[PDB]
RNA sequence: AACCCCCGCCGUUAGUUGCCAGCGGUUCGGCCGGGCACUCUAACGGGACUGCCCGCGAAAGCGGGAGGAAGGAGGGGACGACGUCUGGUCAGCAUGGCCCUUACGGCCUGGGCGACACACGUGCUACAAUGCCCACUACAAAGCGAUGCCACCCGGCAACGGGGAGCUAAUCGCAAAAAGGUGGGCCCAGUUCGGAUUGGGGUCUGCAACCCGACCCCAUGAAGCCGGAAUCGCUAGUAAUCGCGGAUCA
RNA sequence: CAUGUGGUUUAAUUCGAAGCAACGCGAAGAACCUUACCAGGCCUUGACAUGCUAGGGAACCCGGGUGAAAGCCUGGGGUGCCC
């Protein structure tokens, strides 16, 4: 239950709270953010090559 | 003690408000 | 300062004196010192005849109370031997009632460790 | 008509005006022995005041935000030196003899990742 | 606890309210494991699904702010 | 009168955006209010290296928000003309009010 | 550590008697962080002091603690199947950290409920000179002297 | 090692945050006209190189002194060589080979992952007077917010619930930091220490809180009076201690 | 007392991680979702991709019954084109 999961994830049957979220690159379940879309290696991946505008290596 | 929840530090420890803390 | 049935305290301020009842704690306590307007500062040690009388007649004559109140919690238990809810064994079986970790702690509900056990590995 | 210096110690700001007179000193619109009661050691910073020989000579008005109450005590005493050191170029052999003139860029350290508190490592197992 | 409704299924009182009508006798099965016991539902036996097969729990007037679930345990010896 | 933001994640993008606007914009009629910064407003984004299990050793970035003011005192035909017209936000934003 | 000798830090005297090693024994009185809390109770003992002995606090301190410093000590030492422990001097810096602390200890081990009390009362007996922070000064020297046996292993 | 980022000192550029700093009117709220000198905000710079002096040395450099906000890598980051553990991951993904193709695929309803005679690791709250409880009174930082954070009202003991202003947010909101300060109570007790357990009564999200949610109120107040053999952390704004925010998310 | 693991238990209590360098670790959110596990009811070119054949249907929108839902049975609005 890989694919058939990552398309149910689309639609929204029955009640809302079921509604979950999931990654776009990685079908990812667990670890997955609001604001970009995606996962946390999905994420690291694509910040190193400059994919995400002005996400830049931290430092403080 | 941080754990009464029926005192000041019980709640704030908890991090809520009721009869024994005020709200706000 | 005999309040309840054979329930006595002394030299200590009576909002905390009163808490040595079964059925009242630091809330019915100062609730009723406000019913029957006494100083709560004031020791047992020191008290009109009927300060305690009206005292005494508040609380007793109000809610209960030892005996017959310990016996109602007793009653209620005993009536969840029902048809029997899940809450009912667990006061059979004597263990937690409320949604718990047993596999690891429930001490306060398993009298102390039965240490009953055993383990290996390959000797050789 | 007036002297300025200003002071900082650790996420705390300290601004002093001074205006010579009998003694009073007010801080956010405060006596100093108000906003600093019970702090059994505020009444420090101003000790540059004493190495000059004249606390009786002046009448600060200060406002300092933000930070601690400590930090605070440790800013107003860098602004009041750093205020009368400009009010006489000769004052330089007080202020730099003693600490009076430095800042304290000691400050908080960052917590660090695999860590409770940037330094204590968590407990160690084995079994 | 659910303060305003009684959050019961319907699918239940259906088979109830028309075995109401003359108190027939009561073969129930049921997966509302979620539900209330009714005031009055009293005599009517219903078979509980606790996971594996249906516990035909009987009724009586002392149980009735209990659910369901609340008599079809799920697991086997503590 | 009129109020206008400038927002964007490069400082040497947004600083050029706005000096040029003052420049460009003061000649047109009444005088502006030189570009003003805005608190920069972060966002970190924290977790860890490994695909597996590492649940220590980890790695974290941010996004950088900053802003800048400008405020023209008065609007001239000649200044309504210019910066109504050329707008070139290159990776700039812009919002307007009055 | 291994390479440098460690570095003597420098504390700021008093505020109420301009007196470093005043500072230093408010220090040990010191929960968790809290300074105010410590100095209230050093100066609060201080006042203890003035109503039932008219001498100046500072000088009677200043005795007590004198009186708790400790001239030698032992300290274990491995020879070849076998750890003496062996007696020795004791650095001026080290008298006082002792001393300091022991009479802090010596202080919280009292019976009096409130804690300045205590303070007062231990600071007042070992200047006096019998106190259980003195006790603990004695002890610690009858265990060289018995030791003298190895006392040629002066490392 | 050096170039890159954060904290330290000073300048230049810019004024809806700041300012009786100075006269001005103030229903005393930087509220107001006025004003960038302070404070701050964020962008471009200066500053330190063992360059100066004394001593030791063939040299590299070591020790010591002045000026300095700061020296001898000034305090924290990001950065981790050829390789090692047939290390970890086919369950994030990718991928050779192997095996199943009315099921080893797919959909739902209920259960389980939450079991408990026991055993070990990481933790929280404690056993109290350098303490606990109640009233009043101060001083942060970094962040976060449109079917979101909610000012302010009204009701409820409270959880919460009816109204409803500001807000695309240095212009409104989360928001009170807490320890502290002050004055009132407890008086050495298994206690006004400690909050486990069970009875009773409620609220909010959700289609749904029996197995399994979080809170609030009354009553119950268990074990614990500082821990056998053992065993961990930390060298300075560190350890200790106090509270605040954020990701995930009904 | 909270949480992770061994073990026994169980219809199942899903899998992984194993001295330091596994054990508040994948898990920065398990009531149904999740969810890989079990019991019970169902579905087959399939919940998703690419392409071919064939009459209907060629977009789409609203209900009825049955059931625990899924599913299976079933009543009505009816198509702006190259021409």
Same mark, same amino acid.
């Given at each position: 239950?890989? +694919?058939?999961?990552?398309?149910?994830? +689309?639609?929204?049957?029955?009640? +809302?709270?079921?509604?979950?979220?999931?990654?776009?690159?990685?079908?990812?379940?667990?670890?997955?953010?609001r604001?970009?879309?995606?996962?946390?290696?999905?994420?690291?991946?694509?910040?190193?090559?400059?994919?995400?505008?002005?996400?830049? +290596?931290?430092?403080? | 003690?941080?754990?009464?929840?029926?005192?000041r530090?019980?709640?704030?420890?908890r991090?809520?408000?009721?009869?024994?803390?005020?709200?706000? | 300062?005999?309040?309840?049935?054979?329930?006595?305290?002394?030299?200590?301020?009576?909002?905390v004196?009163?808490?040595?009842?079964? @059925?009242?704690?630091?809330? &019915?306590?100062k609730?009723?010192?406000?019913?029957?307007?006494?100083?709560?500062?004031?020791?047992?040690k020191?008290?009109?005849?009927?300060?305690?009388? &009206?005292?005494?007649?508040?609380?007793?004559?109000?809610?209960?109370?030892?005996?017959?109140?310990?016996?109602?919690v007793?009653?209620?238990?005993? &009536?969840?031997?029902?048809?029997?809810?899940?809450?009912?064994?667990?006061?059979?079986? @004597?263990?937690?009632?409320? @949604?718990?970790?047993?596999?690891?702690?429930?001490?306060?509900?398993?009298?102390?460790?039965?240490?009953?056990?055993?383990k290996?590995?390959?000797?050789? | 008509?007036?002297?300025?210096?200003?002071?900082?110690?650790?996420?705390?700001?300290?601004?002093?005006?001074?205006?010579?007179?009998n003694?009073?000193?007010?801080?956010?619109?405060?006596?100093?022995?108000?906003y600093?009661?019970?702090?059994?050691?505020?009444?420090?910073?101003?000790?540059?005041?004493?190495?000059?020989?004249?606390?009786?000579?002046?009448?600060?008005?200060?406002?300092?935000?933000?930070?601690?109450?400590?930090?605070?005590?440790?800013?107003?005493?860098?602004?009041?030196?750093?205020?009368?050191?400009?009010?006489?170029?000769d004052?330089?052999?007080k202020?730099?003899?003693?600490?009076?003139?430095?800042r304290?860029?000691?400050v908080?350290?960052?917590?660090?990742?695999?860590?409770?508190?940037?330094?204590?490592?968590?407990?160690?197992?084995?079994? | 606890?659910? =303060?305003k409704?009684?959050?019961?299924?319907?699918?239940?009182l259906?088979?109830?309210?028309?075995?109401?009508?003359?108190?027939? =006798?009561?073969?129930?099965?049921?997966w509302?494991?979620?539900?209330?016991?009714?005031?009055?539902?009293?005599?009517?036996?219903?078979?509980?699904?606790?996971?594996?097969?249906?516990?035909?729990?009987?009724?009586?007037?002392?149980?009735?702010?209990?659910?369901?679930?609340?008599?079809?345990?799920?697991?086997?010896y503590? | 009168?009129?109020?206008?933001?400038?927002?964007?994640?490069?400082?040497?993008?947004?600083?050029?955006?706005?000096?040029?606007?003052?420049?460009?914009?003061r000649?047109?009629?009444?005088?502006?209010?030189?570009?003003?910064?805005?608190?920069?407003?972060?966002?970190?984004?924290?977790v860890?290296?490994?695909?597996?299990?590492?649940?220590?050793?980890?790695?974290?970035?941010?996004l950088?928000?900053?802003?800048?003011?400008?405020?023209?005192?008065?609007?001239?035909?000649?200044?309504?003309?210019?910066?109504?017209?050329?707008?070139?936000?290159?990776?700039?934003?812009?919002?307007?009010?009055? | 550590?291994?390479?440098?000798?460690?570095?003597?830090?420098?504390?700021?005297?008093?505020?109420?008697?301009?007196?470093?090693?005043?500072?230093?024994?408010?220090?040990?009185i010191?929960?968790?962080?809290?300074?105010?809390?410590?100095?209230?109770?050093?100066?609060?003992?201080?006042?203890?002091?003035?109503?039932?002995?008219?001498?100046?606090?500072?000088?009677?301190?200043?005795?007590?603690?004198?009186?708790?410093?400790?001239?030698?000590?032992?300290?274990?030492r491995?020879?070849?199947?076998?750890?003496?422990?062996?007696?020795?001097?004791?650095?001026?810096?080290?008298?006082?950290?002792?001393?300091?602390?022991?009479?802090?200890?010596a202080?919280?081990?009292?019976?009096?409920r409130?804690?300045?009390?205590?303070?007062?009362?231990?600071?007042?007996?070992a200047?006096?000179?019998?106190?259980?922070?003195?006790?603990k000064?004695?002890?610690?020297?009858?265990?060289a002297?018995?030791?003298?046996?190895?006392?040629?292993?002066?490392?």
């Amino acid at each position: 239950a890989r +694919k058939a999961l990552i398309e149910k994830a +689309k639609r929204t049957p029955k009640f +809302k709270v079921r509604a979950y979220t999931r990654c776009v690159r990685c079908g990812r379940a667990r670890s997955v953010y609001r604001f970009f879309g995606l996962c946390r290696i999905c994420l690291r991946e694509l910040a190193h090559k400059g994919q995400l505008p002005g996400v830049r +290596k931290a430092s403080w | 003690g941080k754990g009464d929840r029926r005192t000041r530090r019980g709640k704030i420890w908890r991090g809520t408000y009721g009869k024994y803390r005020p709200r706000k | 300062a005999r309040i309840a049935g054979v329930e006595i305290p002394r030299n200590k301020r009576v909002d905390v004196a009163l808490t040595y009842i079964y @059925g009242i704690g630091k809330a &019915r306590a100062k609730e009723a010192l406000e019913k029957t307007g006494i100083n709560p500062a004031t020791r047992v040690k020191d008290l009109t005849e009927a300060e305690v009388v &009206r005292l005494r007649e508040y609380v007793e004559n109000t809610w209960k109370l030892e005996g017959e109140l310990r016996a109602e919690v007793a009653a209620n238990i005993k &009536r969840l031997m029902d048809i029997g809810c899940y809450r009912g064994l667990r006061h059979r079986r @004597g263990l937690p009632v409320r @949604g718990q970790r047993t596999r690891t702690n429930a001490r306060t509900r398993k009298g102390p460790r039965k240490t009953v056990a055993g383990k290996k590995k390959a000797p050789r | 008509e007036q002297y300025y210096g200003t002071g900082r110690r650790k996420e705390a700001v300290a601004r002093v005006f001074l205006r010579p007179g009998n003694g009073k000193v007010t801080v956010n619109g405060q006596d100093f022995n108000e906003y600093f009661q019970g702090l059994v050691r505020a009444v420090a910073a101003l000790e540059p005041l004493r190495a000059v020989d004249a606390l009786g000579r002046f009448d600060a008005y200060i406002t300092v935000r933000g930070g601690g109450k400590s930090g605070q005590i440790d800013a107003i005493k860098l602004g009041i030196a750093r205020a009368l050191v400009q009010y006489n170029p000769d004052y330089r052999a007080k202020l730099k003899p003693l600490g009076f003139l430095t800042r304290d860029a000691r400050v908080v350290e960052r917590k660090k990742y695999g860590k409770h508190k940037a330094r204590r490592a968590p407990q160690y197992s084995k079994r | 606890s659910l =303060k305003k409704g009684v959050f019961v299924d319907d699918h239940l009182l259906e088979k109830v309210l028309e075995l109401n009508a003359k108190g027939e =006798k009561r073969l129930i099965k049921t997966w509302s494991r979620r539900s209330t016991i009714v005031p009055e539902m009293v005599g009517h036996t219903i078979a509980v699904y606790n996971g594996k097969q249906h516990v035909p729990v009987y009724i009586t007037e002392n149980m009735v702010g209990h659910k369901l679930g609340e008599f079809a345990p799920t697991r086997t010896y503590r | 009168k009129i109020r206008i933001k400038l927002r964007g994640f490069d400082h040497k993008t947004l600083d050029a955006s706005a000096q040029k606007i003052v420049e460009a914009a003061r000649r047109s009629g009444a005088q502006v209010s030189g570009p003003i910064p805005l608190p920069t407003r972060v966002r970190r984004f924290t977790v860890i290296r490994g695909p597996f299990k590492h649940k220590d050793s980890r790695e974290h970035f941010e996004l950088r928000t900053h802003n800048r003011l400008v405020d023209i005192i008065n609007p001239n035909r000649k200044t309504i003309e210019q910066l109504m017209t050329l707008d070139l936000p290159t990776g700039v934003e812009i919002e307007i009010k009055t | 550590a291994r390479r440098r000798r460690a570095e003597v830090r420098q504390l700021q005297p008093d505020l109420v008697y301009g007196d470093v090693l005043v500072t230093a024994f408010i220090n040990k009185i010191m929960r968790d962080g809290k300074k105010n809390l410590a100095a209230r109770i050093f100066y609060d003992a201080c006042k203890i002091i003035q109503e039932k002995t008219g001498q100046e606090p500072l000088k009677v301190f200043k005795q007590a603690v004198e009186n708790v410093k400790p001239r030698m000590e032992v300290r274990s030492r491995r020879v070849g199947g076998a750890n003496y422990q062996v007696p020795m001097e004791v650095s001026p810096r080290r008298q006082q950290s002792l001393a300091l602390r022991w009479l802090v200890q010596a202080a919280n081990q009292r019976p009096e409920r409130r804690a300045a009390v205590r303070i007062a009362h231990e600071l007042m007996d070992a200047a006096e000179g019998k106190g259980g922070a003195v006790k603990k000064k004695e002890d610690v020297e009858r265990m060289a002297e018995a030791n003298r046996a190895y006392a040629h292993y002066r490392w």
